[PDB]
Amino acid sequence: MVKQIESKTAFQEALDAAGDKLVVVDFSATWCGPCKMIKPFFHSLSEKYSNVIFLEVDVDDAQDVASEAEVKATPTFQFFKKGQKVGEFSGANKEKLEATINELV
């Protein structure tokens, strides 16, 4: 499924609510163009892998999560689990999402 994080509040509750399932967060500028251009891939796995939780954080609406996350290079994909960052990588490599997702799958 998917969950829009509007504030750090939903961020914490989203990780604890995820349970022990994989949790990949995507930090991109929804207002940007070439950045949101990689949404038919990451946000698209929602239909291919229904057993994966994808979080969509807007570095413009939730600047609180972007600041605490120290994300100064978008797009960025972080891998959280049980509420612990266990993997991360920045770059427009949508193909990498598969190799990485199959890592903690």
UniProtKB/Swiss-Prot annotation:
Recorded superkingdom: Eukaryota
Post-translational modifications reported in the UniProt record: In case of infection, ubiquitinated by S.typhimurium protein slrP, leading to its degradation.
Location in or out of the cell: Nucleus; Cytoplasm; Secreted
Pfam assignment, any one: Thioredoxin
Induction (free text): Up-regulated by ionizing radiation.
One GO MF term: RNA binding
Domain Thioredoxin: 2-105
Site note Contributes to redox potential value, residues: G33, P34
GO CC terms in record: cytoplasm; cytosol; extracellular exosome; extracellular region; nucleoplasm; nucleus
Transmembrane annotation, as ranges: none
Consequence of substituting C32S: Loses its reducing activity, interaction with APEX1 and transcription activation
Known function: Participates in various redox reactions through the reversible oxidation of its active center dithiol to a disulfide and catalyzes dithiol-disulfide exchange reactions. Plays a role in the reversible S-nitrosylation of cysteine residues in target proteins, and thereby contributes to the response to intracellular nitric oxide. Nitrosylates the active site Cys of CASP3 in response to nitric oxide (NO), and thereby inhibits caspase-3 activity. ADF augments the expression of the interleukin-2 receptor TAC (IL2R/P55).
Protein name per Swiss-Prot or TrEMBL: Thioredoxin
Protein species of origin: Homo sapiens (Human)
Source lineage: Eukaryota, Metazoa, Chordata, Craniata, Vertebrata
